[model samples]
Target: MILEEKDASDWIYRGEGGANLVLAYAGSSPLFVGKVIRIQKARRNDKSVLTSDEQHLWRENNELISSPNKEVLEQRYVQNVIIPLLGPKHVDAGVRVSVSKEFLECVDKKVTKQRPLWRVNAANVDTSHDSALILNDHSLFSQGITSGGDCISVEIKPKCGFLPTSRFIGKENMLKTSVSRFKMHQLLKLEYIEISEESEYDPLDLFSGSKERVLEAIKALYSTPQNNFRVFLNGSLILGGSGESTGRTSPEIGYAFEDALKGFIQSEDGHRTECFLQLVSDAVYGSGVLDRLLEIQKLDKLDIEGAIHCYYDIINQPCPICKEELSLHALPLDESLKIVKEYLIAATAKDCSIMISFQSRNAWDSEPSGDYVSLKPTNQTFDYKVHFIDLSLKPLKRMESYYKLDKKIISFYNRKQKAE
Candidate 1:
């Protein structure tokens, strides 16, 4: 393995998922610099065990363990599901490393309170799960424009669902609902302009016809807060929530943007915040990046169900309906193919987020000498590039989960109407 002589202390924690831990190589070793490693925490490998939040969606649990096969399956999913749509340029090129018992022992010792959350419980390390190391993009690490004028890298998550809020039956049967995702647009209060010179333009009018209309609809759809959509300016997070929805633009985030672009966007008479919002909207709208991703990876009912079946197969579980395990070797001919297709139809709909980075004249590496103050912009000028992230298959429990979510949403909306 590449880590034969390397110590576990070499890797720095970045972020993590329920199944895997992500870390960046920060040791003095130049050869391993600019690389990120994703290692599976053996104990958390069981896909059947749902988190407290996930229990609302899927209930049944299947006892499982960490295995090498799961890593291979995840990499395969990324290659098949995400690669074609987003392209391989931004995607991490992963190299598998067979994790040894020694490595796990060392990792457990090295992971301390100072490490990120993923490593907080690293003491119970499972050595069976292998790991993958990916080459880190320098642009994602560097702050703002270097003296050489390199572009910034931003990561965003676009949720794909009917509405970005959830309503749960709370104490006394009270309807406890999350803040509406649409509130962000209201907070910005950006004026809609006529994209065409022909006549009065309504945002809804874009859905009247062809691919262009569809593309416009895609752009407009992103305007709402689907939660987790983020903007990283020069590798520093300036907007959006870490994992959950930020709901509306809180005064904290609004002022954060103002401070992040102090010189570029000057504040004057309450107009600066609005102007900053416009700049972000203009950047996101004009790019036409999200539309392309949607066009290429358009999800229908079939694709969603297929992905779910694949998910089950990876976890070595039988389909709830068929009570039979999936197989790649068996030849079921016509009947089996039809059954698989039905599962395919039950898959979730398509959803994606875009990451846009811009080049600014301001230097992000250095801080100002004086006290911070908000200022207004003399002009808006910057170069940007858009990329897509977090493109993974969504899970589904036939259509029952969808029904419950829909019913809750409708009932919540009704309750709001009664209160108002």
Candidate 2:
């Protein structure tokens, strides 16, 4: 179970989020090939273990709250929390393996140059941690399939698709019902300088249950993949940021990315753009995976406006909003806990990414056994597999910050609208 220093060189920097550093297998060991390692990250100088509120939030799942290790907590969160609702077809909780401190240190230093500067400044590999997760490289279509062109995959972070409709939303913030959360958050990100430009893509259009809308959404994302869109060819990033830092999509770089698509997508000159985008649209619309994900996201039933009260009730604090407006205070403790728990799960859904990998196949190839899409425009067919990633657990204490950010985003958007 231990990954020795010898194995350290095999794990190369793939991509990362705020919580984990992902490393794709670089060596040829049959067992580890086509697998990626998930190493938990720690913000330097942070002194917190699992917070007291986190323990309370998961009070019902004794096994989860009892885990002293963050890596195991992540695995259990996906296994016990996400997989059941998400279905087992596309989800794998992955296996935990012990990793030595020397191995961890080696990985940290080896990939430091490759990681974005902001990422290195934010956090580093937690060498003190003893375990890491090994998961199938979901960006690859099928492990051993013989007949296919290069494996081409797409990763889309289609954020919360539904707008909040809870009556608890303030009359002043009634715009939440009409505008998308993704759209609102864009202005906030720009104001904070998190992104250079607002992404033109809309999650609702991608999830609009129409092929035309889905293609429109994909085209928009390709035009401006701030953090929500990525395409990988043969398990390597050919488009989008390396991992977490995608500032803006530009033309010269965009043209090079288009050339990268030349062989994978069948088209002449500029025509490749439409062909490739249509291919992704075909796989996404054909898979119909986002529909189930939307159902889970909708589990946020009450929206943060309504759920914030439940959070305060669970923490035994006076409901601030209720104090101001007196709403939902009569709700019991167990109901309050359920509302908060579901809200965290919905938060997980909101942040997760969908990886859809397509391997080109011909009709002459042995009969397709799994999800297959035939693109009439390109005269090509592909077998695609979809997996959900970045399903990290939201801290129980984050509810407060979620409320804060929610108000700020709404206020910003409202003010901007007023000016317009």
Candidate 3:
């Protein structure tokens, strides 16, 4: 569908200052509902400069480079992070000169210069002469547009893992591993439309109505994963990773997630609950990185919140043996312990109604053991144990914000589904 400049006049931008563009179309194309589309300038390019010392340091540390110079790093970012996170179905992503005004005008005048209204020429911006033009097709919109709050809505019946292995990692496992795959979706329909006040922001916001506050919510998710990393808008998972989508909130998925949430929420000691939320929030809003966390959770078959708590411990806490820091970001392990302690206290007070005696499957002892030692088993041999964590209480203080997002998307889907 053709999206014009006037179409995006209403959507508000998050305005983080990196790029400037008004919201144009912000819903998933039904054909590719969970799929994302971002439109912005064809001219501007993000250039991340590395200082000499930084470059040298990267060269010294194999983790940083072990590749080449800036060129390799730049290309790797696209090949590795961008493609896997956004997926290949996205059109004109990163950079492409396809269908911009200047290019369109040039082609428009060229083809119809003789007739002013001729109708058959093809510009095909993808095959144009300019390298920047060839990069992305967002030039279709007007200039001075930033990309912070450009949003789109989509709907789909999401599948758990990607199908067929051909779409595996491009670079070494450092960039993307072979296990990484795309979510499968059966395209229903696709269309373009303008944004309206009726449209709602992402549902992940804990509770806030202001655009700026909502943007903070988005940034919080972008910064870390505590609030909610990957979210589902009308049953379609919107923001997480490609390989992470799990067929919407199917019966199995919901059961597992609710079970885990309950297990974490109802622990008798209030400190654990606070630490759990804080840890998840930091990961959701902190580094803006979650590939490792997602990988472990997927393998362990963890639901969304359970995975967060597991990783909080895995990433933040001290090394069980060496007693040294081991987080990838090098955050102070001691600080993590202290923060978790404070978080539990606050959570207990806030969620005063939470039940303390909840439990989920222990997968340990054969029968109910009176002793708590069996509950702490990391490895189980024969008997299964039930774990209890209550997930009924909303985890975030900003629960209302996330609810707003959910309501918006749900309303949109209900309307569209009726139309269908």
For each candidate in turn, give its C-alpha RMSD to the true structure in angstroms: 12.2, 2.0, 23.6
How would you encode candidate 3's per-residue C-alpha lDDT over 1-420 as one tens digit per residue?
333334223222211011111122234333222222222222223212344433332332343344333223433433443345333433122322123355333432332332211112211222122222112212111122222122111111111221112222112221112211110001111122211112112332422233344345444433332212333222223333222111223344434433433333334443332333333333222222222222211332221111223224434343232333223224354443333322322222222110111122243535553322122322211111111111011122222332343233334444554675
Top TM-score hit: 2
Write one digit per residue (lDDT tens) for candidate 1, span 354-404.
655555444353652221112125464654555453333333333344334
Q: Which candidate is the best by lDDT?
A: 2
Q: What residue runs in model 1 are displaced by over 4 Å at the alpha carbon?
A: 4-7, 28-34, 41-68, 89-127, 135-152, 161-227, 238-253, 263-277, 296-298, 302-352, 361-381, 393-420
For candidate 1, which ten residues in a row score worst on lDDT? 193-202
The residue-by-residue lDDT of candidate 2 on 1-420, one tens digit each, is 789888888988789888789999989877787789999888873443467877877888877888868888888889998999998888888889899999999999999999988888989999999999999887776665342657888899999988887978988899999999899989999998888888889988988999999999999899888888888888889888886748566778678778887766776877777788888888888889989999999989888999998888888887777633254667777778888999999999999999988777656656665787876777776678889998988888889989999999999999999995
TM-score, model 1 to reference: 0.54
1 against 3, candidate with superior lDDT: 1
Between prediction 2 and prediction 3, the one with superior TM-score is: 2
Model 3 spans > 4 angstroms off = 9-17, 20-24, 27-77, 80-99, 102-420
Give the residue spans of candidate 2 off by over 4 A: 45-49, 144-149, 324-327, 362-367
Candidate 2 local lDDT, residue 202: 90
The lDDT per prediction is 0.42, 0.85, 0.27
Candidate 1 RMSD to the real structure? 12.2
